[PDB]
Structure formats: C-alpha cells, structure tokens
Design a protein around this motif. Sequence first.
Motif, PDB file in Angstrom:
ATOM      1  N   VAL E   2      62.080  16.014 -11.107  1.00  0.00           N
ATOM      2  CA  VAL E   2      60.691  16.130 -11.806  1.00  0.00           C
ATOM      3  C   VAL E   2      60.120  16.374 -13.112  1.00  0.00           C
ATOM      4  O   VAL E   2      60.827  16.690 -13.664  1.00  0.00           O
ATOM      5  CB  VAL E   2      60.574  17.458 -11.218  1.00  0.00           C
ATOM      6  CG1 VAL E   2      58.755  17.898 -10.597  1.00  0.00           C
ATOM      7  CG2 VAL E   2      61.187  17.510  -9.442  1.00  0.00           C
ATOM      8  N   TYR E   3      59.076  15.381 -12.816  1.00  0.00           N
ATOM      9  CA  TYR E   3      58.659  14.754 -14.316  1.00  0.00           C
ATOM     10  C   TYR E   3      56.929  15.519 -14.065  1.00  0.00           C
ATOM     11  O   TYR E   3      56.848  16.400 -13.463  1.00  0.00           O
ATOM     12  CB  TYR E   3      58.423  13.408 -14.620  1.00  0.00           C
ATOM     13  CG  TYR E   3      60.148  13.118 -14.495  1.00  0.00           C
ATOM     14  CD1 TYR E   3      60.707  12.730 -13.280  1.00  0.00           C
ATOM     15  CD2 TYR E   3      61.013  12.836 -15.950  1.00  0.00           C
ATOM     16  CE1 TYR E   3      62.045  12.112 -13.436  1.00  0.00           C
ATOM     17  CE2 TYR E   3      61.865  12.216 -16.112  1.00  0.00           C
ATOM     18  CZ  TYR E   3      62.695  11.969 -14.591  1.00  0.00           C
ATOM     19  OH  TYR E   3      64.037  11.845 -14.599  1.00  0.00           O
ATOM     20  N   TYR E   4      56.081  14.898 -15.363  1.00  0.00           N
ATOM     21  CA  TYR E   4      54.780  14.838 -15.164  1.00  0.00           C
ATOM     22  C   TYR E   4      54.302  13.677 -15.366  1.00  0.00           C
ATOM     23  O   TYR E   4      54.798  13.200 -16.652  1.00  0.00           O
ATOM     24  CB  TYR E   4      54.083  15.668 -16.519  1.00  0.00           C
ATOM     25  CG  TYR E   4      54.287  17.423 -16.031  1.00  0.00           C
ATOM     26  CD1 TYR E   4      53.235  18.051 -15.201  1.00  0.00           C
ATOM     27  CD2 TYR E   4      55.422  17.999 -16.784  1.00  0.00           C
ATOM     28  CE1 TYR E   4      53.706  19.054 -14.189  1.00  0.00           C
ATOM     29  CE2 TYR E   4      55.434  19.761 -15.705  1.00  0.00           C
ATOM     30  CZ  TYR E   4      54.782  20.167 -14.908  1.00  0.00           C
ATOM     31  OH  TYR E   4      54.987  21.532 -14.610  1.00  0.00           O
ATOM     32  N   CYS E  10      48.791  10.415 -10.400  1.00  0.00           N
ATOM     33  CA  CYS E  10      48.398  11.689  -9.569  1.00  0.00           C
ATOM     34  C   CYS E  10      47.812  10.739  -7.714  1.00  0.00           C
ATOM     35  O   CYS E  10      47.138  11.634  -7.308  1.00  0.00           O
ATOM     36  CB  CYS E  10      46.596  11.951 -10.655  1.00  0.00           C
ATOM     37  N   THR E  11      46.464   9.618  -8.355  1.00  0.00           N
ATOM     38  CA  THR E  11      46.405   9.047  -6.699  1.00  0.00           C
ATOM     39  C   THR E  11      47.046   8.571  -6.232  1.00  0.00           C
ATOM     40  O   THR E  11      47.116   7.881  -5.021  1.00  0.00           O
ATOM     41  CB  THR E  11      45.227   8.286  -7.452  1.00  0.00           C
ATOM     42  OG1 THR E  11      45.955   6.672  -7.716  1.00  0.00           O
ATOM     43  CG2 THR E  11      44.568   8.428  -7.972  1.00  0.00           C
ATOM     44  N   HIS E  12      48.114   8.011  -6.957  1.00  0.00           N
ATOM     45  CA  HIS E  12      49.424   7.538  -5.824  1.00  0.00           C
ATOM     46  C   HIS E  12      50.179   8.641  -4.407  1.00  0.00           C
ATOM     47  O   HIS E  12      49.832  10.130  -4.402  1.00  0.00           O
ATOM     48  CB  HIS E  12      50.870   6.931  -6.573  1.00  0.00           C
ATOM     49  CG  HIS E  12      50.857   5.999  -7.947  1.00  0.00           C
ATOM     50  ND1 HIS E  12      48.850   5.128  -6.899  1.00  0.00           N
ATOM     51  CD2 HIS E  12      50.546   5.548  -8.744  1.00  0.00           C
ATOM     52  CE1 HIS E  12      48.871   4.252  -8.201  1.00  0.00           C
ATOM     53  NE2 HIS E  12      49.911   4.037  -9.063  1.00  0.00           N
ATOM     54  N   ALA E  13      51.041   7.863  -4.011  1.00  0.00           N
ATOM     55  CA  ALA E  13      51.912   9.556  -3.116  1.00  0.00           C
ATOM     56  C   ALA E  13      53.005   9.823  -3.578  1.00  0.00           C
ATOM     57  O   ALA E  13      53.234  10.636  -2.763  1.00  0.00           O
ATOM     58  CB  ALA E  13      51.850   8.321  -1.691  1.00  0.00           C
ATOM     59  N   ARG E  14      53.499   9.392  -4.408  1.00  0.00           N
ATOM     60  CA  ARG E  14      54.291  10.075  -5.192  1.00  0.00           C
ATOM     61  C   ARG E  14      54.124  12.151  -5.400  1.00  0.00           C
ATOM     62  O   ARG E  14      54.824  12.461  -5.619  1.00  0.00           O
ATOM     63  CB  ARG E  14      54.886   9.284  -5.923  1.00  0.00           C
ATOM     64  CG  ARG E  14      54.709   9.166  -7.579  1.00  0.00           C
ATOM     65  CD  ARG E  14      54.518   8.431  -8.496  1.00  0.00           C
ATOM     66  NE  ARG E  14      55.366   8.764  -9.825  1.00  0.00           N
ATOM     67  CZ  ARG E  14      56.080   7.835 -10.209  1.00  0.00           C
ATOM     68  NH1 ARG E  14      56.080   7.129 -10.342  1.00  0.00           N
ATOM     69  NH2 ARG E  14      56.354   8.614 -11.563  1.00  0.00           N
ATOM     70  N   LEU E  16      52.269  14.516  -3.943  1.00  0.00           N
ATOM     71  CA  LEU E  16      52.118  15.010  -2.965  1.00  0.00           C
ATOM     72  C   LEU E  16      53.099  16.127  -2.367  1.00  0.00           C
ATOM     73  O   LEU E  16      54.288  15.686  -1.954  1.00  0.00           O
ATOM     74  CB  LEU E  16      51.431  14.066  -1.894  1.00  0.00           C
ATOM     75  CG  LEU E  16      49.921  13.491  -2.268  1.00  0.00           C
ATOM     76  CD1 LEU E  16      50.742  12.215  -1.019  1.00  0.00           C
ATOM     77  CD2 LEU E  16      49.351  14.340  -2.104  1.00  0.00           C
ATOM     78  N   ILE E  39      58.802  24.452  -0.807  1.00  0.00           N
ATOM     79  CA  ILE E  39      58.211  22.925  -1.233  1.00  0.00           C
ATOM     80  C   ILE E  39      58.833  21.850  -0.999  1.00  0.00           C
ATOM     81  O   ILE E  39      60.184  21.723  -1.064  1.00  0.00           O
ATOM     82  CB  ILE E  39      57.936  23.286  -2.996  1.00  0.00           C
ATOM     83  CG1 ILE E  39      57.746  24.604  -4.015  1.00  0.00           C
ATOM     84  CG2 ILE E  39      57.434  22.412  -3.164  1.00  0.00           C
ATOM     85  CD1 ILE E  39      56.242  24.355  -3.003  1.00  0.00           C
ATOM     86  N   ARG E  40      57.660  21.127  -0.714  1.00  0.00           N
ATOM     87  CA  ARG E  40      58.836  19.971   0.727  1.00  0.00           C
ATOM     88  C   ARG E  40      57.555  18.517   0.431  1.00  0.00           C
ATOM     89  O   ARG E  40      56.534  18.556  -0.552  1.00  0.00           O
ATOM     90  CB  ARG E  40      57.922  20.169   2.279  1.00  0.00           C
ATOM     91  CG  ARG E  40      58.251  18.856   2.677  1.00  0.00           C
ATOM     92  CD  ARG E  40      60.117  18.272   2.894  1.00  0.00           C
ATOM     93  NE  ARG E  40      60.439  17.729   3.903  1.00  0.00           N
ATOM     94  CZ  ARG E  40      60.027  16.978   5.277  1.00  0.00           C
ATOM     95  NH1 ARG E  40      59.644  17.987   5.829  1.00  0.00           N
ATOM     96  NH2 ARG E  40      60.971  15.977   6.054  1.00  0.00           N
ATOM     97  N   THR E  43      57.250  12.197   1.240  1.00  0.00           N
ATOM     98  CA  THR E  43      57.929  10.414   0.936  1.00  0.00           C
ATOM     99  C   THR E  43      59.560  10.650   1.174  1.00  0.00           C
ATOM    100  O   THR E  43      59.625   9.681   1.987  1.00  0.00           O
ATOM    101  CB  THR E  43      57.005   9.482  -0.441  1.00  0.00           C
ATOM    102  OG1 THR E  43      57.397   9.943  -1.378  1.00  0.00           O
ATOM    103  CG2 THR E  43      55.990  10.164  -0.763  1.00  0.00           C
ATOM    104  N   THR E  44      59.988  11.199   0.374  1.00  0.00           N
ATOM    105  CA  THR E  44      61.548  11.442   0.078  1.00  0.00           C
ATOM    106  C   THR E  44      62.032  12.863   0.986  1.00  0.00           C
ATOM    107  O   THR E  44      63.430  12.097   1.226  1.00  0.00           O
ATOM    108  CB  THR E  44      61.412  11.852  -1.541  1.00  0.00           C
ATOM    109  OG1 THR E  44      61.678  12.766  -1.233  1.00  0.00           O
ATOM    110  CG2 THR E  44      61.243  11.188  -2.346  1.00  0.00           C
TER     111      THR E  44
END
Lengths: 319, 771, 107, 273, 48, 139
Positions: E2-4, E10-14, E16, E39-40, E43-44
């Motif tokens: 998990v990254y930053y 932030c506007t993309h779907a990854r 969320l 936490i879910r 997409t993945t």
Amino acid sequence: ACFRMTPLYNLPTHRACNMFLESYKAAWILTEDHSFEDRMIDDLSKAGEQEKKPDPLHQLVLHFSRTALTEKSKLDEDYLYMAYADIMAKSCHLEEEVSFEEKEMEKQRLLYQQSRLHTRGAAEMVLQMISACKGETGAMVSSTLKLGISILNGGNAEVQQKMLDYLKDKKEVGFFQSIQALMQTCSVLDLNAFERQNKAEGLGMVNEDGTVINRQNGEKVMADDEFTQDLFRFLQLLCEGHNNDFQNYLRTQTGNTTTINIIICTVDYLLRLQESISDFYWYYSGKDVIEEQGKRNFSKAMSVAKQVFNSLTEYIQGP
Amino acid sequence: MDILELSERLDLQRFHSHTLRLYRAVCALGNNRVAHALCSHVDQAQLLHALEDAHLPGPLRAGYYDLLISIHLESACRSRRSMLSEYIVPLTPETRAITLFPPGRRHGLPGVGVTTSLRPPHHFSPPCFVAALPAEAPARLSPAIPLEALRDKALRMLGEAVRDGGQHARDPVGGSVEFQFVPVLKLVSTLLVMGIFGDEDVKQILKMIEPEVFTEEEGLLQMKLPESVKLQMCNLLEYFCDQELQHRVESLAAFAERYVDKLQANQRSRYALLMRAFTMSAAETARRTREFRSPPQEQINMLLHFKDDCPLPEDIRQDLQDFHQDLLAHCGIQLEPQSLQELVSHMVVRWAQEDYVQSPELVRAMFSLLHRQYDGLGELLRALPRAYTISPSSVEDTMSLLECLGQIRSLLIVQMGPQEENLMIQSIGNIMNNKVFYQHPNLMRALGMHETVMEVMVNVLGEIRFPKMVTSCCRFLCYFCRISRQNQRSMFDHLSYLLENSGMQGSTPLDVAAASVIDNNELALALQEQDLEKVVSYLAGCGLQSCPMLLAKGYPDIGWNPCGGERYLDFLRFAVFVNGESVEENANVVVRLLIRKPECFGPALRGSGLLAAIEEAIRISEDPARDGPNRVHLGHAIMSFYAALIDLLGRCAPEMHLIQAGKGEALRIRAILRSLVPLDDLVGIISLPLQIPTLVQPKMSASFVPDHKASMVLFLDRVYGIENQDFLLHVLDVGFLPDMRAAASLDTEMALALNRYLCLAVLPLITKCAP
Amino acid sequence: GVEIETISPGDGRTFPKKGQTCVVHYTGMLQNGKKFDSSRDRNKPFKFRIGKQEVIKGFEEGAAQMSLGQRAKLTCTPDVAYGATGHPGVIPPNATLIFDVELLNLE
Amino acid sequence: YGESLCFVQHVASGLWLTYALKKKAILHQEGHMDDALFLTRCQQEESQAARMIHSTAGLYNQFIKGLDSFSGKPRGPALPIEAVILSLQDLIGYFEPPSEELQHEEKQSKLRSLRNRQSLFQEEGMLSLVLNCIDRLNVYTTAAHFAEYAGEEAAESWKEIVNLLYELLASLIRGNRANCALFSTNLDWVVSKLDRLEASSGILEVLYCVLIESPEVLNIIQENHIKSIISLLDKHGRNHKVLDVLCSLCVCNGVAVRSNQDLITENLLPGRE
Amino acid sequence: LVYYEGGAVCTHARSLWRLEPLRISWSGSHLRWGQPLRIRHVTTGRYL
Amino acid sequence: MADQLTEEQIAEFKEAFSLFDKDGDGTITTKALGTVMRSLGQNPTEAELQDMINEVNGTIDFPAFLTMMARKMKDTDSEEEIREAFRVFDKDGNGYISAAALRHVMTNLGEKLTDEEVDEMIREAGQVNYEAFVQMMTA
C-alpha cells in the motif's frame, strides 16, 4: 541629439505619411465619441415582437452561454464577446440641488435598462464565464465584470435572486474558487519595480528620432489597479441591498462540498495591502517632499483600499 | 451507366460522393503536385459541364463545386485572404485622385472603383502530362483553368438560380433549395475574393442581391432561404465591407499625401521667415522648439492639434476638418434602405425575427457582421496600424517579398517534411536580401513576419528533427532585433518561451534571448527575476553532469560541463552591463541568486585555487591524451568558462559613485565578490607566461588566448582597484611586461589578439592610475 | 520503337525541323483503353519546341515523322517513355502509351 | 466527514499506520503527528463503476485461464459463455454515447461523465485485459473447424463474442484522446487483422475511431498499412467507411500530412480498375 | 503493498476503500469510536 | 541598431553588393570586401578589414556587410554630431555663446528640461569655448 533632429521638409514623403496616419488616428479618431451602444440594443430588443420563440438579444446571450460550458482547459479569447460586453455595459451606463421626482425617474430608467438585459438570461451568462475562466486574469474578465456591475448597479434585487438560485440548483464549485484565484493575483505597491520605473522615467527621448512609448510599458507598480477595484466593486454590489442570505452563502457554502469564504481572503488581501502601503511609508519616511510619481501611486493604492473598505462594510452592514 | 441514374441507384451514389470527398481531401491544404495528377482523372470539360447540369443529384452536385475550388481555386484563395488584412498602398499618381464619395454626398456602390493596394498574383501553371519529368522539385504551382469563361458561366447559373427562385417550383436543381444555392454561392464567393470579377460584374451581383438599393424580379435577401444559404451570404457581404474598409483606408492615405505636400511647403516657408526675423529674442527660441529641437514625430502631433499652439494659418486647417466630416458621414455617424449598412442591419434582424437559429456558425457570423456595420469608426481604427505606405520605386521588390512571405504562410498549414524544410531556408534566405527588410523596419513587424517564424520554431522544438531549419530561423530573429529598437521590443514578450527551450550546433534560441536585451536599457531594466532564475538553474545543471554530446563522441570523462555553461554566462553579461554602464537592479538580483547555489560556480571555487585550476587546464591542453580525442577541446573550455565567470562578476560590480555614497547595498556586494574570489590568485593568472609565436603558428582553440586575462584585469580594476603604489608597480612589472615586450617583438593571429588585449584593458587601467 | 500508324492523310511535304515550334492537338491513351490525357477537353492546343527536350522522347520522335495536317496514331513503348518510376498518380509503372497526335499548323 | 481527523489502527496489534513520492505505509510503534487523516465520501457514479470493474475482472481472468487450459492441448472446467456474452452486452449499453437530439446542457454533462468513466475503466485494467482475450481467440481463424478445442457450443458462439468484443473496443476509444494514445505502439495489431473476415466491420470502426481523435498515429503510418486498406477495399466490396478512414488519414487538426497523401495517389489512383 | 500518491491517482478508482462492521445487523448505522471494522478495496476485492 | 542610416545608403550598399556578388546568394570572398569598399571612395588599409571578419568562415553575407558599414559610419558621425548640435547655441559659429542666451533656448528643447536641470548643468562646468562643451556634456 535633440539639435540634429531632421525637419519634415528634408524627410521623404512616404515616412512623412506614416507619421501622419498615426497622428491623425490618435488626435481625431480616438477622441471622437459615438453612442451606437444604445441604439443597437433597443432595436434588437424591440425585435422580440413581430408579425414564444427567442428574441435576437436572447439568441445572443444563450450563444454566449453555450460557448462557456464546453469542456476546455482554458477559455479562448473572443473579440466578439469583448465587443458585445462593453456595448451592454455602456447601454446601462447612460442612467448611472436635485428633486424627488427626477431621481426616481433616473432610477426606474436604470432598472428598465437592467430589465431589458437580464430577463433574457444575462445574469447567469456572466457567472458561467467567471466560472469557466479558472483564475486567468486576461482581457475578458475586464469585459464581463464591468458588465456584471452595470447589470447589478444600484442594488437591484431580481438580478441577485436570479444569481443565487442558479448557483444553488447547479451546486458546481468553480465560481467561488475563481474569485479566490482572481483575488490573490492582484498587484500592490511594490518597492522593487518602483525604482526600476524611476530610473527608466529619466530617459525623456531615445536617440535616432524616437519618442518613448510611455503608454506601452505604462506604470509597472499597481498596473492591475483597475481590475482589483472592478472585482471588489462587483463583490460590494452583490450584497448592497442588505440581503442576508448572500453573506451567509459567501461565508460558508453548505450546499457545495468545499467552502471558500471570500471574506477571509478579503482580509488576506487587505492585510497584504496594509503592509505594502506601510512599507511605502517607511521608504518615504526620510524624504521631505513627495514628487508627482509618489502621490500618483499612493492615491492609486488608497482608492482601492477604500473599495475593499466599502466591500467589507456592506458584508457586515446587514444584521 | 449514366451518371443521372444514380438518383435511383442510391448505393453507387454514396460511393462516388465518398470517392469525390477523398478526391478533395488528398489534394487539400495546398498540395498542388497531386492536384495536377488528379486533373487527369477529372477533366475540365466534364467538370464545367457538371456545373450547369440540373439533372444531377443532390450530394453529387454539391461535391463537384467543392472539388473544382479544391483543385484550382484554393492555393490562390488562401494566399490572398491572408494578404487582404494588411494594406500596402504606394504613392503612385493613381492614388492621388481618389475621394470617398464619387463626384457628380451620395455613397457609391461597394466593390466598384479603383484600388492600389499591392497583392501578389496567383501564379498559375498550365497542366501537361507529356512533358519530360526532371531527375528535388523547386515548387509546383496551382493548375491553370481559363477564368474568362468560368466567370461568365458562374454569373449565368447564379443569374438563373435567383430568377427561378421566384416561381417557387416543386422540383428545384439538385432536389432541394439548399443544393441549388449553396454550391453556386460558395463558388461565386471564392472567385470574388481572389479578385477576377470586373466592375460591371460586381454591379450585377449586387443587383442580384438587392436590385432596389444597388441600382445605379425578387431580390435574393427578400426570398426565404435556409440556414446553409444564409451562412454563405455572410461571407459574401464580409467581402463588400472589407472592400468598403479598404477604399476608406486608401482614401485616408490619398488625403495624407495630398496634405503633407502642402504641410512641408508651409513650414519651410515659416522657417525662412523666422531666419529673417530679428525682432524678438525670448520668443525666437519659443518659435524654434518645433522647427529644429522637436523630433519629427512630435511635429505632426503638435501641428494637428487645432480641434476645440499651432502655427498653421487658416488656409490649411479647414481642409482636414472638411475631410474629417466627410469621413464620419461616410461611416454610420450622422454628424448633424438606401445604403449598405442600412441594408445589412435590417437583414440580420429580419433573419433573426424569422425563427430560432440552431446553427452556431451562422448566428456568430450574423452578429459579427452586424457589429461591423454599426461600429464603423472602431473597425477603421483597429485596422489602420496594419496600413502602411511605401514609395512607388520599391514596388518591384515589395511584391517579391509578399510572394515569398505567402510561401511561408502556405507552408504553415502543412506539417514539415524533408523537402518543405529547404523551401523554408530559401524563403527566409530571400527575405534577408530583398532590401525592403532594412529601409522600412516598421512594416515587417506589421505583416506578422516575426510571428510566422516563431510558430515554425514552436512546432519543431515541440529531440530536434530539423537542425538546419531551426538555426536559420533564430538567425533571422537575431538580425531582426538589430534593424530597429522597436523590433526588439516585440521579441521581449516572447522571452519566457525563448529561454525555456535554450537547454546544438550553430545558432541556438538563447542567441535570440541575448539579442533581445542587448544595447537597450529599457528592456534590460524591465526584465523580471523569473527569467533570471531559469538561467542559473540551467547553469547549476552543468556543474554536476557533463556534456551528452562529448562523452558520446569519445571525449575523456570530466565531472562538469565547461562549454555548455559558458553559453549561459555570456548571456548574463548582456543583462547586467548595457552601453558600458552597469545597472544596479539587475546586478543586485543576479548576485543574490548566484551565491545561494554553489554549483553555478566552478568546482575549484566551490576547494582548489583558481590559478591551480588553470595551471591544470594547461596540463590537459598541452597533452594530447588528456585533451579531446574534434573542434571542442576540454582544455580551452575550462578557462573560457572561468573567464566568463570572472568578468560576469566584474560587470555586476557597482561603480565608484555608489561606493562614494552611503549606500549599504553597494559595499555589501563588493564585500561578497572580493571575498568570493581572492586577489593574489588573479595576480598569478595575469602573470602567466604564454607561448609566443615565432620561428610556426599555434592553435587558438587549443592554447591560452589573451581574452581570459582581459577578464581578470577588468575584475581587478572594478572590485579591487589600485589605491597605493606597491600593489601598482608589482602587477605592472610581473603581469604586463612579459605581455608587452612580446608584442614589441611581433612588430599572426596572436599578434592581433593580444594587441586588442592591451589597448582595451590594461591601458585604460594605467590612465586610470596615471596621477 | 515508335510505331506510327496513320489515321487521316496530310500534306506530305512540310515536316518539322530543329528549333521550330509545333502545335499538336493530341489525346493520349493507355494500352487498356483508358484515357489519361487529352488536349481537346481544355480547348487549348499543346505547343512544344522540337529538340530542346520538353516532351518525352517518344513524343518528339513521333511528331518528327509526320506532315502538316496529318493525324496519326502512335504506340510508344515503355522503354522510351516513363520506364521505371513513371509519373505518379497518372500512369502506372511499365505501361504502354498510345497517342493520337494531330499537327494543326506551323510544321 | 472530515471534521474528525481520525487515524486507522488495529484492535489487537495496537500499531499506528504512518508513512515510511511513493511512501510505503507501515504499522509503526513510534507513530507520527501527521497521521490525522480526514474521511471524504466518494460519489455514487464512481462506486458503481468500480464494482463492475471487479465483477468483470473476476469473470475475464477466469475466461483467460479457461481458454488457455486448451490452448496447447487438443480436444478429441466449463467456460461461462452465457456469462461472457450478456456481460459484454450490458457493458456496450453502459458506454453507449448520448443522442444528438438531446439538449446541449444535458448532452455535455453526460459526455464529460462518460469520458471520466472510460478513463477510470482503462486505468484499472479493462483494456489490456480486452486485447488478451482477443489475441487468444483469433488464433482459431475458422468458426467450427479450429474451434473444436472448446466444444460445439463455444464454436457456435465463437462468432458472437468477437463481434461484441470489438464493438466494445470501438466504444472504449470513441472520442477520448487519452485512450486513443494507447494505440500508438500496437497499430499493427489493428492493421494486420483487417482481412481476417471475422467481424470485419468491427476492426474497421476501431481503426476509424482511433484515427480521428489522435494525430500521433497519422505520422507513424508507412506504406504497408495503406496497401492493406486498399486490399481491404478490393476484397470486401465497395464500402464507404473504407473511404472515410482514408479521408481521415490525409489531414489532422487542419494540418496535412504529405507522408500519407502521396501514397494513396500512387496506389489507389493509377490502377484505374 | 500500500502506497501514497497525489491528486491524479485520487480521482482514479484505485484509491477507494469501503468500511464494513463486524456484526450483521444494523450495518448502516453511524460509526463511533472504539468500533472494530474491516477495510475493503472495491476493485481488487482484497481486505487490508 | 541599423536605423541610424537612411534608405539611400542602404539602397547604395545593396547596389554595391549585388554588383560584385558571386551567384546572387549574397556571398563574397575575403578579397571582394576590399574591392567593394574601394569602389565607393572609402579606402581603408588592411587593418580596418582585418578586425571586421574576426568580428564577424570566409562567407561575408549581406547582413554581415551591412552591420560593418553601419559601425564604420556611426563612429565618425557620433564624433561629429555634437558640433552641429552646438551651432544653434551661438550666432556666429566659431564656438562662443553667451551665458544669458543659454537659459531660454536650452530650457525649451523638448526633453522636458525644467529650470533646475540647466541650472545644475552650467554651474558644474561671459562666454565659454566649444571644446569645453563636449568636455562638459560627455563628462
């Protein structure tokens, strides 16, 4: 080199002619005044009736409204919108010991020229194009915001409520962030470009028969003075009729997701303006007299300081 | 099968119309070489026969009129429409007898009259498919079509179309009213804008437009028309208003040559009376301010001030106000339909009161047309600075210039390739020896010459693909900024882009950036700090990484870039030093910016001695293995970077009158630069013995040249100075007497390079310390 | 090889010489029967100078063998007219060219 | 929402989730004072599109390892053909562009909406996933003979899936330039399958929508791509959309390309047949 | 892992995440402090 | 700049350049720059040529030749501009101008000079000679 200046009769005729077309333009054509702005708008407005279809002035403003909401990163400069915006601005600038009957007949005349413009939907047309400007202080915000005042001139109430419901059914952020980006990119009394102006003003005439174009560079310090007073006069007249729901909306936008609070950025610009005129005083604290250059720039800074003072009091004059 | 059976086929109708649009789109945007090769497939007899054939279907008829203008009438139409904006009228006697109103205050017909504005010919070439093919072709012109028979045919099918529109038939030409009027109108519009139509023919087009207003059947505007036909008529009436504007500009220029022949005759007669005038002394200089002292531009501004201090008598001041009220009465101002502006204005509103226009192209073209008619004086004042006047002895080279500038603007609309590059080099190579580029500098700037060269530098710079193209363009803008000073000021607005892409062989856009700020104190003092932080960040890049061109060629590895960063240091001498006097505002901000980044200096001062770096520089320059192993040598570029670093630190130093005052800023800068670079390091470098050429010649790019010592003595004269005598006779003994007896023995390129070194640098120092 | 086959008879005494203009109202065709050029759709007769290498080699060695007012039919081999690369857009490469030349006036 | 400034933390581990541009997130016992994250809700049209990204990716990763189960083994886990077809049929109806007779104030909001959700779909897969199910399916060029490795039901539905697979690829790069810029490196993936004779209307509309939105593809075309398009027109009848892509190949953004304008004139025109 | 990242991601779907409580009933109630949850990623299909 | 010259030197210089140009390129050799200046009366020795090519390869193009004549003409004109600029100050022309004559004709010349600048000008320097006025102008 002033003394070896050639006369006109030794000059050739083709270069003597080009100095004539430029001089006849600046002395006769620029100084001529005409009032075609009233007569074109009234004939397109009486064009609504003939022998529910849109009027020709109504056709123009929705054409100006549709070219605002196309998706583009920046707004193109349109000479036709600049040329039509100042025609609609000077159409209402005609009415803007006297008696009682004459001042109200000047007032109901002015609310008639504002009724002739804004029932066609010009009140939303100006707010779409500050929304689509996105913080670029080009030549077009000088043309739409001078139109924005002349429609909102005198504390008119139906123009403001037509603006308020439009920003509440849309709920699109980008009108309030644009006023914020337009506010922080305003110039104040700088003390770095002021000595650059004082050194360049000493060159009265450039060599080889050249008059210095003082209008090209202009004034380097407070060059953006008109628009930052033109923006704050628009924000003053938005809450001129003591309408309470505007100063709660400009303070906290509970309908939108992000609040901007122009009133804090009003104090942020005036605090920036306080430290600039105060440092302008500390630079001139040792000199005895002030020349015509300094009292020019100080009255320029104090007039915009009074406009933001008038912008701040009408925000708080309502209860 | 017959071509008229496709109206019932409706499948090969669609294929041939889609083939015809491919016939238009291939030979489009000025590609004449395929447009001749397409003339073999579509013959001119079969194309002119399809113009008047009314039994042809709808989209097939509309594509044939668009095809002929695409192959014959577009390369010449685009060039003249680009040339119609600027007005170049010469002082030929055809101009001197022109009035706004025709003699006989009734306004004449638009487009009818005499004009003298110079526009280049269309340059047609006859098509032929049996000639011997050569072998790069120089240029190939648009294919020639006989326009004397095409113009009489174009007026005939339009003359039949307006007359058949009054009967209101149920089956028009093409199947609808749009296909009957649009292809005939756009063809009538394009041969009118190229300018073949005679004066009697344009009187017939205006009678077909409106036979009531334009008389010296039902008209075309009173008829009900759909929105496609309305759009092609706005382009037709945009021509007549531009011709009404062009006739108004030529009449204003014709009046100006009739006025200044009387104006210079009056003023010299007033000077001859003033030189025989001995009756006043205090007022004699007051009459002589305009005559000899005032510049000749300020004479015209002061002499034309007799509205509402002007020595002109009452004979020659009313004729201009007689012209002035004649010009406003020619416009929409009353100054107390039957005219063109009253016809167009009532037509646009009647088109607007008919129904809602849902096409955004027409409604903008309608309101742009209506704004041009009411604001007539505003349209003239915005068009008059693009209006010039030349001598009639320069027309043989000016139309040669406009034929060659039209070559470039016809090359702007197509993307660059391997052959269109060399046509651009020969074109700009002809603008620089046409002799009109130099005597009239204000007209090249009005034509958009400098803008046409920079957008080709935008599209090519974006690696670079055409290096021969980009050097000839920036060389053109470097020599453009030295013909006049206002040519340089239009280039100063472009500096944010001209300095962003500065970081190749030959000329580079930084030379345009250097030529925009040289020898002019106005643009130097108005330069922002934001253009200056980009140069020092480019210079901070050269200190850590080396040259990509050097290590790829096979040069030895050195940790920094000497030859790359020297191009940014000689740029900054031009900003901080103008006309031999150093500015204070730009020198204060460049010293403040250079000292926060230690990488902009060399790695020796960032710490080895400076003489120890230059003694190491001779060590690599003398040895062939340590040097570059072709014109760039490492051993010369290191001292060339350091001498560009040292004299930059000299020219940004304050003068003596700022040290003489109580300014705490000037002695602060002198304290930084004296403590940045030591003195006795420079005493050793100026004392460095050099290889004297005697009995053999050395190489200048591989040895020490005396231009580096001229940098060190100028910095020593400016931040240190000579105050006493033990410092004086020491540097004079050990530093210049091995230099001057070497010049006395050569009484050779080094003999001429060090002789310029003595009489420019040390002998102004010795006369400074002469008492 | 230029095969000159006559179509209509001519004068038979006036033939073109060097440095002399000719007017020729030709119409060219390919071997398949597809017309690629005509000088009568334009109603402008083609005029050329003989010997100065304006036209292709098959055209001038074809026009030199005729008389004034004669109309003949040539079959130019692809070796003598546009052999390898041809003329792009009009004639395909390695194609035989047929010309119906007619000399109107001036040799 | 955003007024709490609250951190995430485990219930049993008791570890602070802090940083280490791309800073990896780690449960550190020291913690930091910049961990006060504020919660912002997403919108409703993004949460629906993100789950059907996962519902399609969970089906199509299973479709590829189902199809590669018999890629190298001849036939002498049942694949979900009925699931692969209707999911494409709803995905094309999800990306279907708005009508032209609609109001412009409503058309622009649906067009800008559609572009963000075709940009959001392509960023998390849904395109390289689409090319790989096609490049595994085109190797059987025949409908019933070479498709015997799967079965009879997959061979009769061999034709229908590639018609929906290419109509969705024609839907996904329609109008948006950022997805049309992905097809610069694999132009020959589109060009070499023009005369495949399997959904030949499918590839042609894909090549048509990718050559009218991006000008960077028009200058990387040499003559072999052009000769295949005349070979497309000369074996698949007198078609009018094959002419429109050739009209779109000459000029772009009002700028002509003479690297492509002359190769049509020397190949299509002098034959005259 | 998990990254930053910035605002384009932030506007993309990854970026969320979806929160689910432990207990079954009344899942759509307002969360409070001292509440365990999971936490879910949407997409993945993975759990943090 | 190059606007110091009129049209008529520039049309004369292109007349000299295109007369002895090689092929219409705008090219000359390092010999032909010498013969093109001696064709117009100007006779420099070879040091005057020797520095100008070092100033500008062997290819002397027409903008390079135009800039070299502009510097060759401006230096003598900038040395002689100031004497004819001194001629309206004195009535006879030898160089002797009155101090009472100089405060109304120098305050009225059009560079917006007040009474204060010419008062500073003459008391940082009866009648004063001509060569002192260059000494007090260039400073």
